[PDB]
PDB file of C-alpha atoms and ligand atoms in Angstrom:
ATOM      1  CA  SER Z   1       0.000   0.000   0.000  1.00  0.00           C
ATOM      2  CA  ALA Z   2       0.941   3.612  -0.693  1.00  0.00           C
ATOM      3  CA  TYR Z   3      -0.140   4.486   2.863  1.00  0.00           C
ATOM      4  CA  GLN Z   4       1.865   1.885   4.803  1.00  0.00           C
ATOM      5  CA  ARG Z   5       4.053   3.016   7.613  1.00  0.00           C
ATOM      6  CA  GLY Z   6       6.369   1.303  10.031  1.00  0.00           C
ATOM      7  CA  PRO Z   7       7.971  -2.145  10.403  1.00  0.00           C
ATOM      8  CA  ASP Z   8       6.337  -5.473   9.594  1.00  0.00           C
ATOM      9  CA  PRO Z   9       4.214  -6.011  12.659  1.00  0.00           C
ATOM     10  CA  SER Z  10       4.025  -8.618  15.365  1.00  0.00           C
ATOM     11  CA  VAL Z  11       2.008  -9.042  18.567  1.00  0.00           C
ATOM     12  CA  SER Z  12       5.089  -7.756  20.424  1.00  0.00           C
ATOM     13  CA  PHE Z  13       5.070  -4.556  18.341  1.00  0.00           C
ATOM     14  CA  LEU Z  14       1.378  -4.031  19.134  1.00  0.00           C
ATOM     15  CA  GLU Z  15       1.775  -4.818  22.866  1.00  0.00           C
ATOM     16  CA  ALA Z  16       4.575  -2.238  23.322  1.00  0.00           C
ATOM     17  CA  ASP Z  17       3.605   1.019  24.898  1.00  0.00           C
ATOM     18  CA  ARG Z  18       4.451   2.950  21.764  1.00  0.00           C
ATOM     19  CA  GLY Z  19       4.972   2.212  18.103  1.00  0.00           C
ATOM     20  CA  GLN Z  20       7.857   3.370  15.916  1.00  0.00           C
ATOM     21  CA  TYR Z  21       7.385   7.131  16.164  1.00  0.00           C
ATOM     22  CA  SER Z  22       7.974   9.614  18.910  1.00  0.00           C
ATOM     23  CA  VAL Z  23       4.881  11.727  19.741  1.00  0.00           C
ATOM     24  CA  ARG Z  24       4.192  15.356  20.575  1.00  0.00           C
ATOM     25  CA  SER Z  25       0.964  17.042  21.547  1.00  0.00           C
ATOM     26  CA  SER Z  26      -0.806  20.410  20.935  1.00  0.00           C
ATOM     27  CA  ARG Z  27      -3.722  21.778  22.891  1.00  0.00           C
ATOM     28  CA  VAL Z  28      -6.851  22.991  21.200  1.00  0.00           C
ATOM     29  CA  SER Z  29      -8.629  25.636  23.280  1.00  0.00           C
ATOM     30  CA  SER Z  30     -12.158  25.048  24.506  1.00  0.00           C
ATOM     31  CA  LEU Z  31     -13.008  28.336  22.920  1.00  0.00           C
ATOM     32  CA  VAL Z  32     -12.924  26.573  19.510  1.00  0.00           C
ATOM     33  CA  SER Z  33     -16.343  26.446  17.813  1.00  0.00           C
ATOM     34  CA  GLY Z  34     -18.059  23.129  17.274  1.00  0.00           C
ATOM     35  CA  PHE Z  35     -16.733  21.066  20.227  1.00  0.00           C
ATOM     36  CA  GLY Z  36     -15.135  21.517  23.649  1.00  0.00           C
ATOM     37  CA  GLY Z  37     -11.495  21.643  22.600  1.00  0.00           C
ATOM     38  CA  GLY Z  38      -8.999  18.841  22.990  1.00  0.00           C
ATOM     39  CA  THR Z  39      -5.461  17.654  22.380  1.00  0.00           C
ATOM     40  CA  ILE Z  40      -3.830  16.751  19.096  1.00  0.00           C
ATOM     41  CA  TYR Z  41      -1.195  13.954  19.309  1.00  0.00           C
ATOM     42  CA  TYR Z  42       1.049  13.505  16.343  1.00  0.00           C
ATOM     43  CA  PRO Z  43       4.276  11.657  15.472  1.00  0.00           C
ATOM     44  CA  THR Z  44       7.524  13.606  15.000  1.00  0.00           C
ATOM     45  CA  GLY Z  45      10.201  12.990  12.437  1.00  0.00           C
ATOM     46  CA  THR Z  46       7.828  11.855   9.680  1.00  0.00           C
ATOM     47  CA  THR Z  47       7.168  12.878   6.098  1.00  0.00           C
ATOM     48  CA  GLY Z  48       4.073  12.624   3.959  1.00  0.00           C
ATOM     49  CA  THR Z  49       0.522  12.444   4.989  1.00  0.00           C
ATOM     50  CA  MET Z  50      -1.293  10.035   7.399  1.00  0.00           C
ATOM     51  CA  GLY Z  51      -4.705   9.103   8.632  1.00  0.00           C
ATOM     52  CA  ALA Z  52      -6.404  11.191  11.277  1.00  0.00           C
ATOM     53  CA  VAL Z  53      -8.645  10.031  14.122  1.00  0.00           C
ATOM     54  CA  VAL Z  54     -10.994  11.768  16.618  1.00  0.00           C
ATOM     55  CA  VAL Z  55     -11.502  10.194  20.024  1.00  0.00           C
ATOM     56  CA  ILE Z  56     -14.527  11.206  22.133  1.00  0.00           C
ATOM     57  CA  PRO Z  57     -15.715  10.370  25.698  1.00  0.00           C
ATOM     58  CA  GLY Z  58     -19.159   9.550  27.156  1.00  0.00           C
ATOM     59  CA  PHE Z  59     -21.692  11.257  29.473  1.00  0.00           C
ATOM     60  CA  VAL Z  60     -20.125  13.592  32.075  1.00  0.00           C
ATOM     61  CA  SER Z  61     -16.617  12.448  31.164  1.00  0.00           C
ATOM     62  CA  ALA Z  62     -13.669  14.484  29.976  1.00  0.00           C
ATOM     63  CA  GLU Z  63     -11.008  13.878  27.368  1.00  0.00           C
ATOM     64  CA  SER Z  64      -8.782  12.382  30.017  1.00  0.00           C
ATOM     65  CA  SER Z  65     -11.038   9.377  30.223  1.00  0.00           C
ATOM     66  CA  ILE Z  66     -10.074   8.162  26.733  1.00  0.00           C
ATOM     67  CA  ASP Z  67      -6.675   9.767  26.271  1.00  0.00           C
ATOM     68  CA  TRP Z  68      -4.690   6.514  26.343  1.00  0.00           C
ATOM     69  CA  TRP Z  69      -5.665   6.205  22.674  1.00  0.00           C
ATOM     70  CA  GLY Z  70      -3.978   9.475  21.694  1.00  0.00           C
ATOM     71  CA  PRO Z  71      -0.251   8.758  22.135  1.00  0.00           C
ATOM     72  CA  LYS Z  72      -0.704   5.052  21.639  1.00  0.00           C
ATOM     73  CA  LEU Z  73      -2.290   5.306  18.214  1.00  0.00           C
ATOM     74  CA  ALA Z  74      -0.276   8.395  17.128  1.00  0.00           C
ATOM     75  CA  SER Z  75       2.996   6.566  17.701  1.00  0.00           C
ATOM     76  CA  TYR Z  76       2.184   4.071  14.943  1.00  0.00           C
ATOM     77  CA  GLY Z  77       1.602   6.821  12.392  1.00  0.00           C
ATOM     78  CA  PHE Z  78      -1.711   8.720  12.821  1.00  0.00           C
ATOM     79  CA  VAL Z  79      -2.765  12.191  13.842  1.00  0.00           C
ATOM     80  CA  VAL Z  80      -5.099  11.617  16.831  1.00  0.00           C
ATOM     81  CA  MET Z  81      -7.209  14.314  18.518  1.00  0.00           C
ATOM     82  CA  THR Z  82      -8.871  13.532  21.850  1.00  0.00           C
ATOM     83  CA  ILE Z  83     -11.788  15.921  22.446  1.00  0.00           C
ATOM     84  CA  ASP Z  84     -14.087  17.307  25.065  1.00  0.00           C
ATOM     85  CA  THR Z  85     -17.696  17.999  24.339  1.00  0.00           C
ATOM     86  CA  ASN Z  86     -19.497  21.326  24.958  1.00  0.00           C
ATOM     87  CA  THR Z  87     -21.054  19.890  28.061  1.00  0.00           C
ATOM     88  CA  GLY Z  88     -20.810  16.538  29.793  1.00  0.00           C
ATOM     89  CA  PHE Z  89     -24.601  16.297  29.432  1.00  0.00           C
ATOM     90  CA  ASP Z  90     -24.500  15.954  25.628  1.00  0.00           C
ATOM     91  CA  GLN Z  91     -26.340  12.963  24.234  1.00  0.00           C
ATOM     92  CA  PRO Z  92     -25.419  10.875  21.160  1.00  0.00           C
ATOM     93  CA  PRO Z  93     -26.899  13.126  18.432  1.00  0.00           C
ATOM     94  CA  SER Z  94     -25.012  16.169  19.816  1.00  0.00           C
ATOM     95  CA  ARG Z  95     -21.873  14.064  20.183  1.00  0.00           C
ATOM     96  CA  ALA Z  96     -22.098  12.984  16.522  1.00  0.00           C
ATOM     97  CA  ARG Z  97     -22.310  16.652  15.462  1.00  0.00           C
ATOM     98  CA  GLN Z  98     -19.226  17.434  17.588  1.00  0.00           C
ATOM     99  CA  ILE Z  99     -17.255  14.488  16.150  1.00  0.00           C
ATOM    100  CA  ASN Z 100     -17.966  15.910  12.679  1.00  0.00           C
ATOM    101  CA  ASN Z 101     -16.895  19.414  13.731  1.00  0.00           C
ATOM    102  CA  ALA Z 102     -13.690  17.985  15.234  1.00  0.00           C
ATOM    103  CA  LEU Z 103     -12.960  16.088  12.003  1.00  0.00           C
ATOM    104  CA  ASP Z 104     -13.570  19.332  10.049  1.00  0.00           C
ATOM    105  CA  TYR Z 105     -11.201  21.073  12.439  1.00  0.00           C
ATOM    106  CA  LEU Z 106      -8.376  18.597  11.756  1.00  0.00           C
ATOM    107  CA  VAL Z 107      -9.035  18.810   8.052  1.00  0.00           C
ATOM    108  CA  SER Z 108      -8.622  22.565   8.259  1.00  0.00           C
ATOM    109  CA  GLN Z 109      -5.369  22.339  10.198  1.00  0.00           C
ATOM    110  CA  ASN Z 110      -3.743  20.467   7.399  1.00  0.00           C
ATOM    111  CA  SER Z 111      -3.571  23.635   5.282  1.00  0.00           C
ATOM    112  CA  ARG Z 112      -2.802  26.186   8.041  1.00  0.00           C
ATOM    113  CA  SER Z 113       0.813  27.359   7.784  1.00  0.00           C
ATOM    114  CA  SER Z 114       0.962  27.905  11.638  1.00  0.00           C
ATOM    115  CA  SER Z 115      -0.378  24.459  12.560  1.00  0.00           C
ATOM    116  CA  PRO Z 116       2.022  21.784  14.010  1.00  0.00           C
ATOM    117  CA  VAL Z 117       0.157  19.264  11.886  1.00  0.00           C
ATOM    118  CA  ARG Z 118       0.285  21.252   8.633  1.00  0.00           C
ATOM    119  CA  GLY Z 119       0.713  18.896   5.649  1.00  0.00           C
ATOM    120  CA  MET Z 120       0.497  15.755   7.849  1.00  0.00           C
ATOM    121  CA  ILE Z 121      -3.135  14.802   7.342  1.00  0.00           C
ATOM    122  CA  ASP Z 122      -4.574  12.824   4.502  1.00  0.00           C
ATOM    123  CA  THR Z 123      -7.944  14.439   4.617  1.00  0.00           C
ATOM    124  CA  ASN Z 124      -9.574  11.464   2.812  1.00  0.00           C
ATOM    125  CA  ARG Z 125      -8.513   8.942   5.532  1.00  0.00           C
ATOM    126  CA  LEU Z 126     -10.434   9.655   8.698  1.00  0.00           C
ATOM    127  CA  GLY Z 127     -11.419   7.524  11.673  1.00  0.00           C
ATOM    128  CA  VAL Z 128     -13.339   7.816  14.917  1.00  0.00           C
ATOM    129  CA  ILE Z 129     -13.144   6.146  18.347  1.00  0.00           C
ATOM    130  CA  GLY Z 130     -15.823   6.933  20.976  1.00  0.00           C
ATOM    131  CA  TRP Z 131     -16.895   5.786  24.409  1.00  0.00           C
ATOM    132  CA  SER Z 132     -20.487   5.050  25.478  1.00  0.00           C
ATOM    133  CA  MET Z 133     -22.701   7.916  24.282  1.00  0.00           C
ATOM    134  CA  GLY Z 134     -19.674   8.958  22.254  1.00  0.00           C
ATOM    135  CA  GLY Z 135     -19.753   5.468  20.782  1.00  0.00           C
ATOM    136  CA  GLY Z 136     -23.423   6.015  19.801  1.00  0.00           C
ATOM    137  CA  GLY Z 137     -22.098   9.245  18.220  1.00  0.00           C
ATOM    138  CA  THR Z 138     -19.412   7.213  16.460  1.00  0.00           C
ATOM    139  CA  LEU Z 139     -22.002   4.876  14.891  1.00  0.00           C
ATOM    140  CA  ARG Z 140     -24.052   7.904  13.779  1.00  0.00           C
ATOM    141  CA  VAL Z 141     -20.994   9.337  12.014  1.00  0.00           C
ATOM    142  CA  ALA Z 142     -20.094   5.928  10.554  1.00  0.00           C
ATOM    143  CA  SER Z 143     -23.549   5.956   8.837  1.00  0.00           C
ATOM    144  CA  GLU Z 144     -22.826   9.230   7.033  1.00  0.00           C
ATOM    145  CA  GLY Z 145     -20.213   8.020   4.548  1.00  0.00           C
ATOM    146  CA  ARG Z 146     -17.177  10.156   5.215  1.00  0.00           C
ATOM    147  CA  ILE Z 147     -15.168   8.227   7.777  1.00  0.00           C
ATOM    148  CA  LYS Z 148     -13.243   5.047   6.786  1.00  0.00           C
ATOM    149  CA  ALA Z 149     -13.017   3.360  10.235  1.00  0.00           C
ATOM    150  CA  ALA Z 150     -15.110   3.367  13.416  1.00  0.00           C
ATOM    151  CA  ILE Z 151     -14.351   1.972  16.877  1.00  0.00           C
ATOM    152  CA  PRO Z 152     -17.229   2.319  19.334  1.00  0.00           C
ATOM    153  CA  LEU Z 153     -16.097   1.550  22.914  1.00  0.00           C
ATOM    154  CA  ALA Z 154     -18.889   0.223  25.182  1.00  0.00           C
ATOM    155  CA  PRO Z 155     -21.381   2.147  23.019  1.00  0.00           C
ATOM    156  CA  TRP Z 156     -24.670   3.573  24.267  1.00  0.00           C
ATOM    157  CA  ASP Z 157     -27.585   4.816  22.171  1.00  0.00           C
ATOM    158  CA  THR Z 158     -31.350   4.835  21.976  1.00  0.00           C
ATOM    159  CA  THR Z 159     -31.611   3.041  18.598  1.00  0.00           C
ATOM    160  CA  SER Z 160     -29.829   0.574  16.340  1.00  0.00           C
ATOM    161  CA  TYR Z 161     -30.898   2.615  13.284  1.00  0.00           C
ATOM    162  CA  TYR Z 162     -27.519   4.179  12.686  1.00  0.00           C
ATOM    163  CA  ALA Z 163     -25.560   0.970  13.283  1.00  0.00           C
ATOM    164  CA  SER Z 164     -27.777  -0.657  10.618  1.00  0.00           C
ATOM    165  CA  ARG Z 165     -26.651   2.040   8.192  1.00  0.00           C
ATOM    166  CA  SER Z 166     -22.878   1.992   8.929  1.00  0.00           C
ATOM    167  CA  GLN Z 167     -20.792   2.757   5.882  1.00  0.00           C
ATOM    168  CA  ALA Z 168     -17.410   2.269   7.531  1.00  0.00           C
ATOM    169  CA  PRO Z 169     -15.551  -0.851   8.810  1.00  0.00           C
ATOM    170  CA  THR Z 170     -16.705  -1.042  12.445  1.00  0.00           C
ATOM    171  CA  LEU Z 171     -15.036  -2.700  15.448  1.00  0.00           C
ATOM    172  CA  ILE Z 172     -17.120  -2.654  18.594  1.00  0.00           C
ATOM    173  CA  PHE Z 173     -15.428  -3.246  21.913  1.00  0.00           C
ATOM    174  CA  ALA Z 174     -17.928  -4.508  24.520  1.00  0.00           C
ATOM    175  CA  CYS Z 175     -17.395  -4.811  28.239  1.00  0.00           C
ATOM    176  CA  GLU Z 176     -18.762  -8.023  29.683  1.00  0.00           C
ATOM    177  CA  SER Z 177     -19.646  -6.698  33.106  1.00  0.00           C
ATOM    178  CA  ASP Z 178     -21.009  -3.341  31.878  1.00  0.00           C
ATOM    179  CA  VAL Z 179     -23.945  -2.059  33.959  1.00  0.00           C
ATOM    180  CA  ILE Z 180     -24.023   1.429  32.451  1.00  0.00           C
ATOM    181  CA  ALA Z 181     -24.385   0.449  28.771  1.00  0.00           C
ATOM    182  CA  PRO Z 182     -25.366  -3.232  29.201  1.00  0.00           C
ATOM    183  CA  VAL Z 183     -24.123  -5.316  26.280  1.00  0.00           C
ATOM    184  CA  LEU Z 184     -27.490  -6.962  25.727  1.00  0.00           C
ATOM    185  CA  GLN Z 185     -29.165  -3.564  25.241  1.00  0.00           C
ATOM    186  CA  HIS Z 186     -26.400  -1.652  23.399  1.00  0.00           C
ATOM    187  CA  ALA Z 187     -23.153  -3.131  22.052  1.00  0.00           C
ATOM    188  CA  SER Z 188     -24.611  -6.551  21.058  1.00  0.00           C
ATOM    189  CA  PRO Z 189     -27.708  -5.304  19.132  1.00  0.00           C
ATOM    190  CA  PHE Z 190     -25.649  -2.580  17.517  1.00  0.00           C
ATOM    191  CA  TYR Z 191     -23.109  -5.076  16.251  1.00  0.00           C
ATOM    192  CA  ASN Z 192     -25.837  -7.473  15.159  1.00  0.00           C
ATOM    193  CA  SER Z 193     -27.423  -4.696  13.107  1.00  0.00           C
ATOM    194  CA  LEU Z 194     -24.277  -3.788  11.155  1.00  0.00           C
ATOM    195  CA  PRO Z 195     -24.538  -4.417   7.410  1.00  0.00           C
ATOM    196  CA  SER Z 196     -22.917  -7.473   5.761  1.00  0.00           C
ATOM    197  CA  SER Z 197     -21.095  -5.222   3.304  1.00  0.00           C
ATOM    198  CA  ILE Z 198     -18.520  -3.743   5.668  1.00  0.00           C
ATOM    199  CA  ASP Z 199     -15.688  -5.370   7.524  1.00  0.00           C
ATOM    200  CA  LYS Z 200     -16.848  -5.771  11.139  1.00  0.00           C
ATOM    201  CA  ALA Z 201     -15.854  -7.213  14.471  1.00  0.00           C
ATOM    202  CA  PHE Z 202     -17.244  -7.522  18.042  1.00  0.00           C
ATOM    203  CA  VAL Z 203     -14.705  -7.963  20.849  1.00  0.00           C
ATOM    204  CA  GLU Z 204     -16.160  -8.432  24.304  1.00  0.00           C
ATOM    205  CA  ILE Z 205     -13.599  -8.025  27.061  1.00  0.00           C
ATOM    206  CA  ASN Z 206     -13.778 -10.647  29.801  1.00  0.00           C
ATOM    207  CA  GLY Z 207     -14.906  -9.239  33.135  1.00  0.00           C
ATOM    208  CA  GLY Z 208     -14.670  -5.656  31.862  1.00  0.00           C
ATOM    209  CA  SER Z 209     -16.555  -2.864  33.555  1.00  0.00           C
ATOM    210  CA  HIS Z 210     -17.897  -0.016  31.429  1.00  0.00           C
ATOM    211  CA  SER Z 211     -14.481   1.704  31.188  1.00  0.00           C
ATOM    212  CA  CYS Z 212     -12.816  -1.434  29.759  1.00  0.00           C
ATOM    213  CA  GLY Z 213     -12.216  -0.001  26.301  1.00  0.00           C
ATOM    214  CA  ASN Z 214     -10.716   3.261  27.462  1.00  0.00           C
ATOM    215  CA  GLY Z 215      -7.126   2.012  27.774  1.00  0.00           C
ATOM    216  CA  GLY Z 216      -4.585   2.536  30.448  1.00  0.00           C
ATOM    217  CA  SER Z 217      -5.472  -0.311  32.828  1.00  0.00           C
ATOM    218  CA  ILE Z 218      -5.281  -4.121  32.500  1.00  0.00           C
ATOM    219  CA  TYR Z 219      -6.771  -4.570  29.026  1.00  0.00           C
ATOM    220  CA  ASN Z 220      -4.133  -2.904  26.800  1.00  0.00           C
ATOM    221  CA  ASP Z 221      -3.125  -6.117  25.043  1.00  0.00           C
ATOM    222  CA  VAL Z 222      -6.490  -6.821  23.407  1.00  0.00           C
ATOM    223  CA  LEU Z 223      -7.199  -3.091  22.845  1.00  0.00           C
ATOM    224  CA  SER Z 224      -3.888  -2.667  21.074  1.00  0.00           C
ATOM    225  CA  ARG Z 225      -3.991  -5.783  18.975  1.00  0.00           C
ATOM    226  CA  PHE Z 226      -7.469  -5.156  17.655  1.00  0.00           C
ATOM    227  CA  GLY Z 227      -7.583  -1.352  17.734  1.00  0.00           C
ATOM    228  CA  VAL Z 228      -4.282  -0.441  16.132  1.00  0.00           C
ATOM    229  CA  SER Z 229      -4.769  -3.206  13.557  1.00  0.00           C
ATOM    230  CA  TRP Z 230      -8.259  -1.946  12.762  1.00  0.00           C
ATOM    231  CA  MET Z 231      -6.952   1.535  11.908  1.00  0.00           C
ATOM    232  CA  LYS Z 232      -3.965   0.179   9.998  1.00  0.00           C
ATOM    233  CA  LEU Z 233      -6.093  -2.105   7.856  1.00  0.00           C
ATOM    234  CA  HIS Z 234      -9.006   0.381   7.258  1.00  0.00           C
ATOM    235  CA  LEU Z 235      -7.290   3.763   7.205  1.00  0.00           C
ATOM    236  CA  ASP Z 236      -3.938   2.712   5.653  1.00  0.00           C
ATOM    237  CA  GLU Z 237      -5.133  -0.309   3.569  1.00  0.00           C
ATOM    238  CA  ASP Z 238      -2.190  -2.081   5.333  1.00  0.00           C
ATOM    239  CA  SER Z 239      -2.848  -5.753   4.738  1.00  0.00           C
ATOM    240  CA  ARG Z 240       0.110  -6.665   7.057  1.00  0.00           C
ATOM    241  CA  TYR Z 241      -2.379  -6.176   9.890  1.00  0.00           C
ATOM    242  CA  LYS Z 242      -4.946  -8.721   8.630  1.00  0.00           C
ATOM    243  CA  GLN Z 243      -3.043 -11.456  10.495  1.00  0.00           C
ATOM    244  CA  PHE Z 244      -4.185 -10.018  13.860  1.00  0.00           C
ATOM    245  CA  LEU Z 245      -7.836  -9.622  12.873  1.00  0.00           C
ATOM    246  CA  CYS Z 246      -8.488 -12.798  10.826  1.00  0.00           C
ATOM    247  CA  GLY Z 247      -6.928 -16.174  11.605  1.00  0.00           C
ATOM    248  CA  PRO Z 248      -6.555 -16.353  15.308  1.00  0.00           C
ATOM    249  CA  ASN Z 249      -8.974 -18.148  17.598  1.00  0.00           C
ATOM    250  CA  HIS Z 250     -10.110 -14.920  19.274  1.00  0.00           C
ATOM    251  CA  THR Z 251     -12.536 -16.330  21.809  1.00  0.00           C
ATOM    252  CA  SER Z 252      -9.892 -18.583  23.203  1.00  0.00           C
ATOM    253  CA  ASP Z 253      -7.915 -15.506  24.368  1.00  0.00           C
ATOM    254  CA  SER Z 254      -8.241 -15.194  28.173  1.00  0.00           C
ATOM    255  CA  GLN Z 255      -9.071 -11.486  27.768  1.00  0.00           C
ATOM    256  CA  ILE Z 256     -12.003 -12.136  25.346  1.00  0.00           C
ATOM    257  CA  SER Z 257     -15.334 -13.490  26.524  1.00  0.00           C
ATOM    258  CA  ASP Z 258     -17.008 -13.185  23.130  1.00  0.00           C
ATOM    259  CA  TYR Z 259     -15.979 -12.499  19.537  1.00  0.00           C
ATOM    260  CA  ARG Z 260     -18.003 -12.074  16.338  1.00  0.00           C
ATOM    261  CA  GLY Z 261     -16.950 -10.965  12.867  1.00  0.00           C
ATOM    262  CA  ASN Z 262     -17.074 -11.493   9.141  1.00  0.00           C
ATOM    263  CA  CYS Z 263     -13.554 -12.597   8.258  1.00  0.00           C
ATOM    264  CA  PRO Z 264     -11.989 -13.016   5.859  1.00  0.00           C
ATOM    265  CA  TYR Z 265     -11.735  -9.291   5.063  1.00  0.00           C
ATOM    266  CA  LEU Z 266     -11.437  -8.754   1.275  1.00  0.00           C
TER     267      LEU Z 266
HETATM  268 CL1   CL Q   1     -22.563   7.609  28.294  1.00  0.00          CL
HETATM  269 CL1   CL Q   2     -19.893  -0.983  34.758  1.00  0.00          CL
HETATM  270 NA1   NA Q   3     -11.847 -16.277  26.230  1.00  0.00          NA
END
């Protein structure tokens, strides 16, 4: 692929705290229109353009909740912006609008001569990661046709309508023990509703409470192996990452209580 970055991968490469690039960050003021500000993480030392990803939290949570994803994913070769919403009380439709405004914001930074990410962003290769109500927001955006990869984390929403209309390869992380967005009412029906025409996966984390997809605790191995691979394969067309997503006996992993998907990915 024209978009491939980094060494030929292994589980060890994915399990490491960082990928091949050093990372820097830049704050985006909450005064910005369209969302509550955030932090842009980006790799240093690179040339050319790369995929860009927005990461969004859930109800009454801040960007810190999901910020493990920022440096982790950036270090493999992505521009990754973790955001706050306008208020913690925003619901999924509002969160979808703010994901779109944050994506537009990154797109705009690519051509701003003062931006630290000027010229780094392939504005046709965009992804989204979102927790809980932000994961409902993620599925809403996935149904709109712009983004090329979606990772809902312990999603919450009031309908499966948008999941049934997803236009982007979608990996849902579920948390087995979730009592806030119970899997039987949210992540499972949303996955089950996804169309047959997209690459898709459901990874339910064994014993996980509702925060199990956020990163930064005891679940980084599964989150890394599936999550980085998902963005590599779907944003970079990097078929070197298929080996992690299709082949292995996922349910047999101690960290996975349930797996579903439509491998092989073609
Ligand atoms: Cl929520
Ligand atoms: Cl919980
Ligand atoms: Na298992």
